Amino acid sequence: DTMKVINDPIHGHIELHPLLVRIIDTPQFQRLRYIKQLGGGYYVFPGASHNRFEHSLGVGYLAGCLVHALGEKQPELQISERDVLCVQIAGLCRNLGHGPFSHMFDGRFIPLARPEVKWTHEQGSVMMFEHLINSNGIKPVMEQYGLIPEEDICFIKEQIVGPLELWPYKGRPENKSFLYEIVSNKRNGIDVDKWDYFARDCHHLGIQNNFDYKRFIKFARVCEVDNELRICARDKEVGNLYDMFHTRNSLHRRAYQHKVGNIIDTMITDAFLKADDYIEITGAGGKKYRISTAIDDMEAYTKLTDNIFLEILYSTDPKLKDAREILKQIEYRNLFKYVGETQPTGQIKIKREDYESLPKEVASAKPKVLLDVKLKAEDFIVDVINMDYGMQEKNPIDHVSFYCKTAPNRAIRITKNQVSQLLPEKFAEQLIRVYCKKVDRKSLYAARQYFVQWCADRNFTKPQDGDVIAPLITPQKKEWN
Amino acid sequence: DTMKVINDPIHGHIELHPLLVRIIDTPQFQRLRYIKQLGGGYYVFPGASHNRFEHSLGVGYLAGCLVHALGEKQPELQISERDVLCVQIAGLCRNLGHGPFSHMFDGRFIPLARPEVKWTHEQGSVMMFEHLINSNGIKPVMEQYGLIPEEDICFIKEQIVGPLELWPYKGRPENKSFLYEIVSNKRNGIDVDKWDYFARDCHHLGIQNNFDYKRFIKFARVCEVDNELRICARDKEVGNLYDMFHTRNSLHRRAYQHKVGNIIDTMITDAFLKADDYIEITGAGGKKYRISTAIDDMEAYTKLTDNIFLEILYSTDPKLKDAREILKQIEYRNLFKYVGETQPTGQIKIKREDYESLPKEVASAKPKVLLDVKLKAEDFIVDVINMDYGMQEKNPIDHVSFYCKTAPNRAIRITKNQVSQLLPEKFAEQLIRVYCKKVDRKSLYAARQYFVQWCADRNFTKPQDGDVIAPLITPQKKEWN
Amino acid sequence: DTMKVINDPIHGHIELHPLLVRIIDTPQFQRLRYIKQLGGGYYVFPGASHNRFEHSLGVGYLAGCLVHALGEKQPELQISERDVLCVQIAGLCRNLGHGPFSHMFDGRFIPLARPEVKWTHEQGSVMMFEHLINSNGIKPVMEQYGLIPEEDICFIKEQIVGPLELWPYKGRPENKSFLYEIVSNKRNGIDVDKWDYFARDCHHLGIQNNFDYKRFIKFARVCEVDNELRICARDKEVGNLYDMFHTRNSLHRRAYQHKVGNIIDTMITDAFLKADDYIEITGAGGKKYRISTAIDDMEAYTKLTDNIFLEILYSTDPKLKDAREILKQIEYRNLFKYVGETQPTGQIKIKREDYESLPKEVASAKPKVLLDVKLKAEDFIVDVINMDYGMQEKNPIDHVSFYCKTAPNRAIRITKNQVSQLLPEKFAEQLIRVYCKKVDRKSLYAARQYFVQWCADRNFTKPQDGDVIAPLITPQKKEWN
Amino acid sequence: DTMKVINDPIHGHIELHPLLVRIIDTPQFQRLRYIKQLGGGYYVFPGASHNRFEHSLGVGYLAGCLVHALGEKQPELQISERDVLCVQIAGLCRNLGHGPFSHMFDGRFIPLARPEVKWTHEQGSVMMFEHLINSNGIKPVMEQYGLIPEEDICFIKEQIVGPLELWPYKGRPENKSFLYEIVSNKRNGIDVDKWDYFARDCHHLGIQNNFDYKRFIKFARVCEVDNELRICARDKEVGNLYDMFHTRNSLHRRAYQHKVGNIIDTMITDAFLKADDYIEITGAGGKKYRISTAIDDMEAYTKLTDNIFLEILYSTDPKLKDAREILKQIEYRNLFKYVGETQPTGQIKIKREDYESLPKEVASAKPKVLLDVKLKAEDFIVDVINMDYGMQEKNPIDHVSFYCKTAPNRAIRITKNQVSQLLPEKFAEQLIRVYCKKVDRKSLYAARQYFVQWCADRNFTKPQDGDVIAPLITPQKKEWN
Ligand SMILES: Nc1ncnc2c1ncn2[C@H]1C[C@H](O)[C@@H](COP(=O)(O)OP(=O)(O)OP(=O)(O)O)O1
Ligand SMILES: Nc1ncnc2c1ncn2[C@H]1C[C@H](O)[C@@H](COP(=O)(O)OP(=O)(O)OP(=O)(O)O)O1
Ligand SMILES: Nc1ncnc2c1ncn2[C@H]1C[C@H](O)[C@@H](COP(=O)(O)OP(=O)(O)OP(=O)(O)O)O1
Ligand SMILES: Nc1ncnc2c1ncn2[C@H]1C[C@H](O)[C@@H](COP(=O)(O)OP(=O)(O)OP(=O)(O)O)O1
Ligand SMILES: [Mg+2]
Ligand SMILES: [Mg+2]
Ligand SMILES: [Mg+2]
Ligand SMILES: [Mg+2]
């Protein structure tokens, strides 16, 4: 029509369709300029200033790229301009539901603040998309470019959140099933969302990315699998897919789960919880919401961003003193002190309901040394991190379909033994990090003794620095010697 | 405390001395995390999310690099750990005085809001440095690492702003003159500050940087010039310096003075001006300041960042409706409309006192064409932009000293004719951009007719699109052919 | 056969059509793996190992990109798959005629070895393309993919060399004129060939490129200019084009005309000249050719690459001793010694026929100092380098057509004065570099005295290091001081 | 006479000491400009034009970096300028022994040509270093810069090849043990050689590198481990080291063992074997050597490079017809055809003595498919590729020492279970690739049936494409269904 050109550092010159421009140029979309992609990460990696907004353009752009590519290779798929635009729109909009500091909000804050509700960024994205549509008169614009809003909005939301609830989708039929594998791939997780963040986060973080999305796209084809058309990878490229999940895991270990970044996320959460009663956000009809209740009114949620942090930091209301103090502690780098890191053994798993009980456990361990300070449950933070290949215990590569040079229309499967013996044996594990809220040297030492003792007690793995931090405790455990 | 290692995307792994960590970990320094480097630029270049904070670490790092390098090549300079630390500190701190949206604040807002006061980021940086020092008990830490606060604080501020009041400096004597040429080079402008921003802005903007600071540093030496020790470049490398200023010009043309970015800056300024009476920021002793008066109290200025934008945007105060509306217009992409761009001719220059009178001039032109809509002065914005090589009319390369392979201690001068005939004739020009506040089709057409007529009237250059936008007006002027 | 995917460092994953694969997979094309892009450059820039082969794939790929892009925006152009393939083929093949060490061969060797012949890489490329086609049965394969060999081969050669010989081309008609502006743009020089080399050479050289080809392509349109369809740039993008030529100039100053690289090129040439009688290359019908006569037989030229250097280096024939010695001198880094660099003044220019007379002139200058050695003409090399914007004295931007946002189908012109006063006044100049073949310290000093005297004599510019290398000579000339 | 600066694309501006320049500027060193780093890799990865020469400068530069860094952190190590220079020299020179096409020579050609002798690049490097030293009068230059040639040359060779002769080294004593861990790390393989090639190969190959050597160096310290001084990593960084080996394995899978690159290596080897009797290279005293015997005379080996390929390709000697033909087949892309790829199962391993018997085994399998063509042993190539983490069956991280934030001088050990459950179970495996030398469609089909049958017979893993290429063979094996 008249394409708008945007210069992205990761993707270069992107073209945006007028319809996408209209969706972008709304308060609900522009809100994402005020939400850091990596949350507390930026307080550790000074390069990670980037916000969800730019990620969103990238995801939208990549969605478009993959759908166009599948189109050009296989006209028999009958992919229409209508289909392309919906995949683009879903890509653009699948981050609409992120809250202040991204993962912090949906990962730490809302679980603690509103444990009765179950909340996901996906649900938020659907709701906010709905709000964006209705507040900005998008439906006629969609119609103007040949979209059918009733069906297409369904399709778009399904891309975002999954089956709305044996074919479960209502936005498109089975012959178009592959379209659901682009923006948010519930089948195996190979989706353009990941591709943008691997590239963009790395560009910002200052750590370089091993994975080539352009290659993946060139080698992508659609084939029949059990009477559904699905996206297939080239057989010989399976190694690259294993690599992709490895890359995801690396970025977690190096950046997204960084020990200090996590604590900063935790401290911001603590502050928000303490501020929750006193901060007001005005939603629909002038009705007032809290940080924790903004998820209930999309008009209010529109105005909930990283700005909440500075609203607290700059406040003078005495009621907000407690929250303000925690943020000040963050500024002076008076952070909770990292004690150590350990893992469960065998397939012992620690469920979410047990998280609360863990600080108590550490405080209750009885190391056989004299300690100048005695510490209590409240003095300890235990952070449990699930590291997996995106499908709990399962190997996502078992959920990928492949094709061979010699027969491109014929989908096959490849098992782990068929690829390499050097690949992981398991695909999920847990990290336990322990910090101490008491910052002084005497407290830190004591915390370490409790911690290493607790590790021994529960038959967790030997802390890497165990012999150094707790020389008196490590000889007790036979396995460690 | 010992050395902190920080991963920067531009520079890789930087080391920060404990003393620099102490300066960084303060409200006054951390404040820079909340100020966008390129201001409104981010609303045009979605990559340009970066803030002054990260730039500052880079500038500090680069300052350290150059001073260390000079040290290792020339021990005769007697550069001490004390010297290095001060150059690092100056580098770290020469952005402390930046206001919300960087250049917008000191370039547009303060000139309009407080025309009586004369305000520079440099002055702000000195003041905020002072405030940082005094609020955080830095002086004993400086002493602990062998600095002499009285002299060294002087040295640091002099690096930031220039002579504080025949050798004019009091922080260091003549034999150390070259130290003043690293962080903020008043002699010719080749300084590490530029080097960081060229690299970092490019990384973010998605433009590619063609200038090599590491090469410059390798080839840098200190030589005696008229009984002062100054930083000299290798003769052969002069072409690279011409290139460096060209690069600066390119970044201005392409990014920093982008027509839409400038308008967004302008609209944000307008909003702030309209908000100025109602937004209140608490400074020292609970005393209240306005956006325009925060520069008077450093405690208040500490809390003045990009956050002001969102404070306005999210306000419900009826008094703030006007300002809030402008920001909403920015969000809906209802911007002032670009009319055109022109320049003066010959030696005609446009003085600062005449800026106000220019909208009136455009509205007063008599196009000799029938118009359905008539426009007024207030419907036009005229932005005058000075593009120069950093030294007004002068060629900064004439203020650089060089040395030869054959005699490394002997400074020479190189003239323009000695380098290339293909270099610029002049080193300063002006751009005049005109926008119209009336957005509709009929108004835009009219604005163009006035504008092109005005250009003709004043013997400005023919707008590039003159024949297209104003076909009736362009034939009048003979010079335009 | 379907698409072959090839992973290029600059361009990422390229697709090659089966027809292109067939052209590539021939001795005539694979020959380009054995010819360094930057010739002697690699002996200065250790990164510059790249060969013409890879450049060729890139130029082919970019040709395809531009033609496809024009196609997608403007179906009214009626661009066919046939057209695309021919543009691709031309792009792929316009380096086929390069000789050993690239520019060394066509720039230094053939002019000296065969002054009667006029030889260009373009002519060579046409000839070699013809040989490739005929030796490998390409014409039927072309037909198989819907090319019409008679017309299409003509089109391809015309793209490479210009009109083979008021519309001069026979491969396509006027309505398709813009196709001639892609691979080798005789009109203004903005062509994909440059785009690949800017990107690739920089990647290898370790110097970074300022210019964005992908942006150019996004903003490219075809418009009617004087009843021909031509490629037009967007008005506002003119600044970028001036930048492009500046970039070209920079790469010449920094890399392609580097003083040592040029001498190495010169020494290699000298060696080849001395080896010319004794090296034999077998051509068509078992007939034998020399380095200098291989351009006469394409079968022999096929076997003429950088390999001749090592054939000489490794030779034991006493007849080859002289040539072998020069190459050995290159290996021991016993190079001709750089004396200095100067330029003409005003409009005086130095014609190609006068190059020979210049060594004599330097040797004949009478500096008023006592010298222990006296030097002769043959001891001096004078290298004259033309640096220009690709169209001799002319400004190539005067040969570019533009379009405006408001009227995309309407081509306009933009003059220099309409863009910036900071742009170059002239577009062509000459560098004179002088080296001395006598390497010892006494000879070097003497050579400098002759040289600086000669500069004075001819009213050339003062060498940058004049006061250092020749302190006795420089005071004589009033203008210098 | 003084320091050379050289611009490397990977490392930027390197400084080279005069002594290093003298070593570089010799026929023995310059020879490495004519040996492709990745051998046949360039015929698959068009970017991989780079030669051993440039790699060598990088390895030398990085060696210098690590030794300097250890120096600056720990002056108590007593590292001298002498030590630095020797580590630089070893780094610079540990590729001197590479033959034409690098790994082709030492991996395929010499094993086949001279099975009686055991030959390594390391041994070649030592010999060539000796030859370089003696032919170029380096010993006096070494003395001039404060080296003691007898001791230092010993040290240098020991760095390259291991103990020349309870402390086994004679070049330095135990207190300097860590110096042996920089250039060629026999303990665990973490050496600067790898660091350069990861960076450089990636830069050229067009794959991005996910390992950060600069980070490693910043975190490196020397500690006492069992009364030897060793290079230790920070505890927290162990995950990065696991990543490093994973990256090495990826580069092997993706680039260094690429199926086509390996075949091209194999074809070049075949050609050389066929050329071996007729190519003559003149060594010391005019005595004549063959490709296979050049390793016996360093004077001859000096003149043995990639140039042998082109000597063959351009030859007219009828005796060389057979070798010439194979190279011509490479040019026409008439390569031996990839049949398939398989692995052993469980801990079954395939002995080196059995490699020769494997083609026979494939030819002897009796597939139940109807075939027009019967193939013989000589029609099949069976390539067994050992992929491991550089220490056979062993995990190199078990051979790394670590230190903790809290006690930097105290080395500890970290086991696999202490790091992650998602790490590899084994650290060595085998790939079996089969090609067929008969190129035609009918032969290829037959070869596949033999191959998949052979796989079944020997209880190898099911080829990835087994059910597609050999549908008639695959149902026989129960395990595969
Ligand atoms: N010269 C440049 N080089 C690189 N990127 C640029 C340049 N100019 C602008 N950009 C970036 C900024 C934006 O992300 C994107 C849009 O480009 P630009 O043509 O400036 O848009 P615009 O909307 O101001 O132009 P138009 O006048 O056609 O509306 O490209
Ligand atoms: N694995 C990694 N690779 C690259 N950059 C990293 C990695 N881990 C952290 N970084 C970045 C983030 C920070 O800017 C910087 C320092 O990281 P890190 O050494 O983990 O700090 P830290 O303060 O947590 O460690 P310590 O235990 O030494 O106090 O480097
Ligand atoms: N995993 C990889 N990642 C990046 N580039 C790769 C990878 N594998 C190969 N390449 C490069 C090498 C070549 O330039 C290009 C061709 O890819 P590749 O798939 O290896 O071709 P191929 O011809 O060997 O396979 P096939 O003929 O079986 O499809 O991509
Ligand atoms: N302007 C440049 N920018 C980047 N790299 C450059 C530039 N000029 C040269 N190089 C590269 C080429 C070589 O790798 C290295 C050495 O450059 P250069 O300074 O020209 O040495 P040189 O030996 O010719 O100078 P001199 O002999 O006068 O010291 O840097
Ligand atoms: Mg998802
Ligand atoms: Mg400045
Ligand atoms: Mg050209
Ligand atoms: Mg090794």
Tab-separated table of N, CA, C and O in Angstrom, chain B residues 65-99:
chain	number	residue	atom	x	y	z
B	65	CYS	N	41.992	3.948	29.210
B	65	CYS	CA	42.777	3.305	28.175
B	65	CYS	C	43.807	4.268	27.610
B	65	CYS	O	44.972	3.916	27.510
B	66	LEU	N	43.371	5.465	27.218
B	66	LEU	CA	44.291	6.372	26.550
B	66	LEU	C	45.389	6.808	27.529
B	66	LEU	O	46.560	6.846	27.151
B	67	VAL	N	45.019	7.098	28.792
B	67	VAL	CA	46.005	7.605	29.734
B	67	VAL	C	47.021	6.516	30.066
B	67	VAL	O	48.202	6.814	30.161
B	68	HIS	N	46.559	5.266	30.198
B	68	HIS	CA	47.434	4.131	30.458
B	68	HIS	C	48.394	3.929	29.288
B	68	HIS	O	49.585	3.677	29.489
B	69	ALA	N	47.866	4.025	28.063
B	69	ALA	CA	48.664	3.809	26.864
B	69	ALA	C	49.772	4.862	26.779
B	69	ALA	O	50.923	4.549	26.452
B	70	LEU	N	49.421	6.124	27.072
B	70	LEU	CA	50.395	7.189	26.952
B	70	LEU	C	51.521	6.905	27.943
B	70	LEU	O	52.701	6.977	27.576
B	71	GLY	N	51.105	6.494	29.157
B	71	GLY	CA	51.971	6.068	30.244
B	71	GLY	C	52.985	4.995	29.817
B	71	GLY	O	54.165	5.106	30.117
B	72	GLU	N	52.524	3.949	29.131
B	72	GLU	CA	53.375	2.801	28.883
B	72	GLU	C	54.399	3.124	27.798
B	72	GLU	O	55.518	2.644	27.853
B	73	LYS	N	54.028	3.957	26.827
B	73	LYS	CA	54.926	4.351	25.760
B	73	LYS	C	55.936	5.367	26.276
B	73	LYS	O	57.079	5.336	25.866
B	74	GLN	N	55.514	6.286	27.150
B	74	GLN	CA	56.359	7.414	27.525
B	74	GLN	C	56.445	7.593	29.047
B	74	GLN	O	55.783	8.463	29.634
B	75	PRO	N	57.286	6.776	29.736
B	75	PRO	CA	57.415	6.873	31.191
B	75	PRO	C	57.954	8.239	31.604
B	75	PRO	O	57.713	8.680	32.726
B	76	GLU	N	58.585	8.945	30.661
B	76	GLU	CA	59.092	10.289	30.898
B	76	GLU	C	57.966	11.262	31.212
B	76	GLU	O	58.208	12.342	31.731
B	77	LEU	N	56.720	10.894	30.910
B	77	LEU	CA	55.606	11.778	31.180
B	77	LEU	C	55.333	11.797	32.684
B	77	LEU	O	54.716	12.739	33.178
B	78	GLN	N	55.815	10.763	33.404
B	78	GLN	CA	55.641	10.609	34.848
B	78	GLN	C	54.151	10.519	35.192
B	78	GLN	O	53.671	11.188	36.107
B	79	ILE	N	53.398	9.709	34.442
B	79	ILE	CA	51.978	9.577	34.720
B	79	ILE	C	51.822	8.609	35.894
B	79	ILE	O	52.371	7.520	35.836
B	80	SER	N	51.082	9.009	36.944
B	80	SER	CA	50.942	8.224	38.173
B	80	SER	C	49.575	7.553	38.243
B	80	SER	O	48.651	7.978	37.543
B	81	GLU	N	49.446	6.571	39.159
B	81	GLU	CA	48.168	5.912	39.418
B	81	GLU	C	47.117	6.952	39.806
B	81	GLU	O	45.948	6.852	39.447
B	82	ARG	N	47.570	7.992	40.498
B	82	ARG	CA	46.714	9.088	40.898
B	82	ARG	C	46.150	9.797	39.673
B	82	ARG	O	44.967	10.151	39.649
B	83	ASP	N	47.022	10.041	38.687
B	83	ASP	CA	46.627	10.712	37.457
B	83	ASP	C	45.583	9.879	36.719
B	83	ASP	O	44.567	10.397	36.265
B	84	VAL	N	45.870	8.578	36.608
B	84	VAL	CA	45.019	7.646	35.903
B	84	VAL	C	43.637	7.674	36.542
B	84	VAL	O	42.626	7.772	35.839
B	85	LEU	N	43.592	7.616	37.877
B	85	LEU	CA	42.308	7.536	38.546
B	85	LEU	C	41.492	8.796	38.281
B	85	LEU	O	40.282	8.728	38.099
B	86	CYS	N	42.154	9.951	38.242
B	86	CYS	CA	41.436	11.200	38.046
B	86	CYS	C	40.881	11.301	36.631
B	86	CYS	O	39.784	11.796	36.442
B	87	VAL	N	41.645	10.828	35.650
B	87	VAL	CA	41.191	10.842	34.274
B	87	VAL	C	40.007	9.888	34.156
B	87	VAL	O	38.991	10.236	33.556
B	88	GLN	N	40.117	8.718	34.793
B	88	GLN	CA	39.004	7.779	34.809
B	88	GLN	C	37.758	8.427	35.416
B	88	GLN	O	36.668	8.292	34.873
B	89	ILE	N	37.930	9.130	36.539
B	89	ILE	CA	36.808	9.696	37.277
B	89	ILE	C	36.132	10.776	36.436
B	89	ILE	O	34.908	10.821	36.337
B	90	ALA	N	36.955	11.616	35.810
B	90	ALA	CA	36.425	12.659	34.962
B	90	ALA	C	35.613	12.012	33.840
B	90	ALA	O	34.475	12.417	33.593
B	91	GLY	N	36.189	10.999	33.177
B	91	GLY	CA	35.500	10.325	32.090
B	91	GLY	C	34.146	9.775	32.529
B	91	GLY	O	33.151	9.965	31.836
B	92	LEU	N	34.129	9.100	33.683
B	92	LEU	CA	32.957	8.487	34.283
B	92	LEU	C	31.876	9.530	34.531
B	92	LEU	O	30.681	9.240	34.379
B	93	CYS	N	32.295	10.757	34.893
B	93	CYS	CA	31.370	11.706	35.488
B	93	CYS	C	31.006	12.866	34.575
B	93	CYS	O	30.261	13.740	35.018
B	94	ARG	N	31.484	12.906	33.324
B	94	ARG	CA	31.239	14.093	32.518
B	94	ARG	C	29.861	14.078	31.858
B	94	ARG	O	29.590	14.978	31.058
B	95	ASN	N	28.988	13.114	32.225
B	95	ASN	CA	27.593	13.112	31.775
B	95	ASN	C	26.584	13.283	32.921
B	95	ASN	O	25.382	13.169	32.709
B	96	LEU	N	27.065	13.599	34.134
B	96	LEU	CA	26.213	13.615	35.317
B	96	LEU	C	25.107	14.674	35.216
B	96	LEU	O	24.057	14.508	35.846
B	97	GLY	N	25.334	15.719	34.395
B	97	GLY	CA	24.476	16.893	34.317
B	97	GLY	C	23.385	16.818	33.248
B	97	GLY	O	22.646	17.793	33.027
B	98	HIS	N	23.278	15.667	32.575
B	98	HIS	CA	22.270	15.497	31.544
B	98	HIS	C	20.873	15.511	32.139
B	98	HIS	O	20.666	15.044	33.258
B	99	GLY	N	19.942	16.074	31.369
B	99	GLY	CA	18.574	16.151	31.851
B	99	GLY	C	17.683	15.165	31.116
B	99	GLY	O	18.176	14.427	30.279
